[PDB]
Amino acid sequence: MKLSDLISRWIDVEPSKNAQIILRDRYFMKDLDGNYLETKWEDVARRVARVVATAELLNPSYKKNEKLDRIKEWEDIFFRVLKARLFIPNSPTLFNAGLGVKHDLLWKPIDQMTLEDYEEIYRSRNHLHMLSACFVVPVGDSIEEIFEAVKEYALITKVGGGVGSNFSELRPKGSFVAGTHGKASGPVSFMHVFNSAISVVALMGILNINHPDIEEFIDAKKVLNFFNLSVGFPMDKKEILKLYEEDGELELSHPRSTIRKKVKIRELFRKIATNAWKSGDPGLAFLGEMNKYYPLYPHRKINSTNPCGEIGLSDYEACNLGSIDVAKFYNNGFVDLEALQELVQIAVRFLDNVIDVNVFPIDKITKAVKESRRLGLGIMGFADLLYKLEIPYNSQEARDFAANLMAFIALHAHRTSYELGKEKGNFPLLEISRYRTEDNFVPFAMGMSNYDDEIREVMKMTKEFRRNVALLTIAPTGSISNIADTSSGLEPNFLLAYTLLYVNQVLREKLNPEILKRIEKELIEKGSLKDIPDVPEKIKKVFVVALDIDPMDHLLMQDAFQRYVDNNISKTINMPQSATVDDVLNVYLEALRTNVRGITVYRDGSL
Amino acid sequence: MKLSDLISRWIDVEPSKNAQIILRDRYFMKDLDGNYLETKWEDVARRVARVVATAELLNPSYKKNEKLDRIKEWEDIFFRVLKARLFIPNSPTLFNAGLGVKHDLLWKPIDQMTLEDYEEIYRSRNHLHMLSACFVVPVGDSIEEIFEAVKEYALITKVGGGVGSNFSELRPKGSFVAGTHGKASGPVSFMHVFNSAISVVKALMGILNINHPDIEEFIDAKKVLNFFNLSVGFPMDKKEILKLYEEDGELELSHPRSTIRKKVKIRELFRKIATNAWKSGDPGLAFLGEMNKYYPLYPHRKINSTNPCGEIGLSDYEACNLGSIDVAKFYNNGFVDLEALQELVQIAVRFLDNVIDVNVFPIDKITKAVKESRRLGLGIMGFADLLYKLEIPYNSQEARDFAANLMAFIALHAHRTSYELGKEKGNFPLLEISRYRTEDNFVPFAMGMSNYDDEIREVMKMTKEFRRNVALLTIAPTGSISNIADTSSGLEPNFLLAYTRFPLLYVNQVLREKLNPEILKRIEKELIEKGSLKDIPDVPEKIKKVFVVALDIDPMDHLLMQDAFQRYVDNNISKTINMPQSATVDDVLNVYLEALRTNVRGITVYRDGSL
Ligand code: B12
Ligand SMILES: Cc1cn([C@H]2C[C@H](O)[C@@H](COP(=O)(O)OP(=O)(O)OP(=O)(O)O)O2)c(=O)[nH]c1=O
Ligand SMILES: Cc1cn([C@H]2C[C@H](O)[C@@H](COP(=O)(O)OP(=O)(O)OP(=O)(O)O)O2)c(=O)[nH]c1=O
Ligand SMILES: C[C@H]1O[C@@H](n2cnc3c(N)ncnc32)[C@H](O)[C@@H]1O
Ligand SMILES: [Cl-]
Ligand SMILES: [Co+2]
Ligand SMILES: [Mg+2]
Ligand SMILES: [Mg+2]
């Protein structure tokens, strides 16, 4: 059906009292006296839609006469899509849209908006108007660069950004410092400062596997409570796998130190596994794998991710995200690829426009975003969608469907970026990117869909016109999925029921209302359906939660999506409390064989 | 006696075994490979004198055809004064003079030096060539400013500076924050970040004003912040605060960017401070209002903070280099050789002012603030030992009159020298807007305890016209440089007459000259044990009275000595008010009230047995 039909079915559906708490809590704009400027989700949609459609001011394809019409059109479509909660941008966009803009412009009826009005919104966006979630900054090997980075951290965190860095440039603890004839503190010690900084104003800290301080880093939490830590693998994944299998040795070294050392790669991996087994940190960041698909590599280079891993970013680059709720696209046992296609084109445009009306706390970031125009279009509602299609999450069926769904989005996303590159101009760096200097460059692995051939061609076309360097991600959507009363990102539901009691909205519609009342006592207790008597088999099988799905089944779902995502993916590999450190190692080894670009594990009941 | 002859008496007196250990440890320069480029104090003196003499290149009264001879004469005089240890600049000068310069230039014999050698020295000073002890930077009420200040702490600390800040601009904990509708973390929380920053760079002063809404929390901050010394700031008139106390009044704690507002009994507030200092020796008191009363640039510029040890009150981004004269070496048959001292004060002021010219700061704002004000910190050390030689008890009116007079004498000549240097090299850029020119009868200290007052007043009138420096004097702890000079520290009494640090024996050398060597071997054991002569039998009453140590001297006599000196010092003074273990919190409060009445610009107390 038409997207406009789908909008009708949804646009009048108000958020659950549950989502309404979150909204009143931190999304509804309040003035300085504290009073509410927004009291209904609808008000948010209007403000955001109006701000992001303002970008069309810059559109060189629009005649000045029609300029007001075009803008009003995009506002409306952005608005409708936003109010129906079919697509939602990252929290910073919802938080900060229109900050600095007069309160008489952001909500007034769209029929009263003049060109004057929009031009005014554009000009009055203030230094707080920061609409992107994900940042990376470098941390150079000097006191000067280090503390400039600490300041950068505080500035980005102030405006609601999440920032990460690779700290491997910092020379190892004990290394010679010429300027003081003393000895260097080492990266782990400096990280404590970044931590202290943020504790008064969420972070990704990466150290490469071959840094002499890697071992101290791996145990750094047992303090750095505001960091997620990942171990960095800048080399090819194949290469590390090979070394591990040969029980080979890895040389720890650094350019600005005489400190060097041999360590068994297996012992290094076991150290990481043990710590992760204990506490869920550190993760693995396959940086070399990210650059392999980075269109600007090696002119520019990905060294780190944002805090949740889903976006690989070069120095000073930032990325804005948004997700589509695919559970809302269910229609009589099928995914509505007609409405969805339309929505992808709209979302890519919305996200690309966000860049235009975005304000960053640092000029180097502004430059980097303008050069690349990286976007992060993703999905939520996936698990709930499977529930509707009655497909077990932990099944090859699920994974084939997943790869297929992502492929479709990937194809239409890059299609749209082609058209946007045509209408508005390419990203300035297209010319030096592999989309131009290579033949058959594809931003991701593929190999699990019938769509591949059509994707391979649309990549060829972006040799001439491309608005964005990369387009796709799967984020955690923790907060925006609660607003969209749907499941989070690509994750299965963690629980089907929990306390006022809640029961999954889709389980509610399949299961016999009678049974629901009986088993619920046990369900909230055991957090699963699989050992509850007299529940239809195919309901136990369909309505699986995170912990019903074994580690490998989580991994391979991540693989499936990653094959059609040119950025990274947020995926927790959940693990039974009974898992051993070896079980964790096996996940790492398997991960090295798949196409995943990062690994995060959490063993149930370990913290 | 001419200075040149005092120099001969001291120049070949070798530093003690103790001083040489310190010099080897930290002051003798090394190459990248840990090898010694310097092995004797003489080498340090040559290096420093040469680098500081190099400033004379910039001297507009020298002709291109005389500069070489004038520079060599200054290096010569600087060298001999230094080697003799009659005057020694602050540690960073000893540490960093010469950094960047070819090693075959820094110790080359002076007779072989060319005009091009000196210009090469001047040009090769590297970014680490930072020769000043004392810095203050602002910390504005924004995330931007805060972390810019943290960055500055790191940079200043790297190159060897000590930095202080007044944190009172930071809005109270819990205050409204516009950009996030969040709540401010507060000055105390932010100070934890500055502390964390210093913890990884291998010392700070932290001030919060008495009327800040978080003052109570600040006062309790260390009861974490291990690198900070903390003082409470008093930006109002000392008189106003004493009167409020005496009238049992209340103080409005408020802040301009916060609705967080509160009333407190100034007496309860003081007792809290005194209670804390009683336990732990912190926080101190900083009389900023009293510093500003005497600040030649107030109120265009304002002193909001001191450096870590409190002796220099500095405006934002201002820095100051210090140097101290060992007055114990000026003792000559029962009197202070004022003829020699006058000459050394003249040379010392020029040396310190030259340091500015060859200094390299890590931040442009600092560089600018120093060039505009040219503030100096000439002080003294060896004061206690000098009193030992004159046979004057530290805890007497006689000693305090002597001190005020000694200090007035130095101040007169240092300031006369500034006039001269301003006439020769140019005035400090801001003279024109200072109170030396805009005001009549401006004197930058209280006076009132010397026959030198009228003469000081005359010279201050003169400096309306010519003046090289905004201020010239201080008394520093001189913890390390007094050890190098083998003399007592700053204006402090000796803490002990016989002791050991980490190691071995220090035994006061003036004691070792007066006391009967027989009686010395006798009491030596008891002395180290009891840390004082006070009640050791078989020791002459005369000696007991002169050879008093810090804890022999009651708190008021410590305080009154500080006041005597402060009447003739244009910056501030580092002084510990030592108190006996039996001291009460009321005893502390009394020290405070008396401090409010005297001319001291700050107060630090320590009760024996606190920590
Ligand atoms: C400079 C100084 C400081 C500095 C040191 C940093 C710097 N900028 O150099 C600062 C501001 C941190 C400081 C603080 C205090 N100090 Co203090 N300090 C001195 C001073 C004047 C210099 C000593 C020195 O540099 N020696 C040379 C080096 C080579 O020898 P060192 O032994 O290795 O020096 C180190 C230690 O002495 C240490 N240190 C500093 N203060 C204290 C105090 C004690 C009790 C100890 C054990 C060590 C110690 O710091 C030095 C390295 O920086 C001496 C008095 C003197 N001797 O002239 C005191 C002195 C040791 N300090 C003293 C005191 C009491 C304090 C405070 C507790 C008092 C207060 N009111 O705040 C505070 C708190 C810190 C502490 N004591 O733990 C007393 C000790 C009394 C006693 N019975 O032990 C002394 C003797 C001063 C006095 N006139 O009474 N101090
Ligand atoms: C100055 C200083 C640096 N460091 C660390 C921070 C950086 O990782 C590294 C480089 O510091 P830098 O600030 O660049 O030191 P430098 O230029 O004076 O010396 P060099 O040329 O040898 O680099 O050393 C410390 O750990 N402690 C210190 O006191
Ligand atoms: C942004 C922020 C500020 N602060 C404190 C630090 C400063 O003391 C003070 C001001 O910070 P600012 O950086 O000035 O915050 P702001 O400009 O957005 O808010 P306002 O316009 O009201 O000044 O608030 C925090 O404690 N946490 C924070 O997250
Ligand atoms: C022992 C040395 O420590 C310095 N010191 C310790 N605390 C302070 C303070 N709060 N203010 C000024 N100086 C202080 C004293 O000035 C003394 O010289
Ligand atoms: Cl195990
Ligand atoms: Co979580
Ligand atoms: Mg360096
Ligand atoms: Mg502000």
TrEMBL record, chain B:
UDP binds at S91, N307, C309, E311, T478, G479, S480, I481. DGTP 2 binds at D141, I143, K158, R171, A178, S185, V200, V201. Its cofactor is adenosylcob(III)alamin. Cob(II)alamin 1 binds at D282, C309, N578. Residues 132-606 form the Ribonucleotide reductase large subunit C-terminal domain. DATP 2 binds at H127, D141, I143, K158, K202. GO terms for molecular function: ATP binding; cobalamin binding; ribonucleoside-diphosphate reductase activity, thioredoxin disulfide as acceptor. Adenosine 1 binds at N229, L230, D282, T604. DTTP 2 binds at D141, I143, K158, R171, A178, G179, S185, V200, V201, K202. DTTP 1 binds at R26, S91, E311, T478, G479, S480, I481. It catalyses: a 2'-deoxyribonucleoside 5'-diphosphate + [thioredoxin]-disulfide + H2O = a ribonucleoside 5'-diphosphate + [thioredoxin]-dithiol. CDP binds at S91, A133, N307, C309, E311, T478, G479, S480, I481. Residues 14-99 form the Ribonucleotide reductase large subunit N-terminal domain. Adenosine 2 binds at L230, S231, D282. The keyword Cell division does not apply. Disulfide bonds join C134-C320. Catalyzes the reduction of ribonucleotides to deoxyribonucleotides. May function to provide a pool of deoxyribonucleotide precursors for DNA repair during oxygen limitation and/or for immediate growth after restoration of oxygen. This is Vitamin B12-dependent ribonucleotide reductase. The lineage of its organism: Bacteria, Thermotogati, Thermotogota, Thermotogae, Thermotogales.
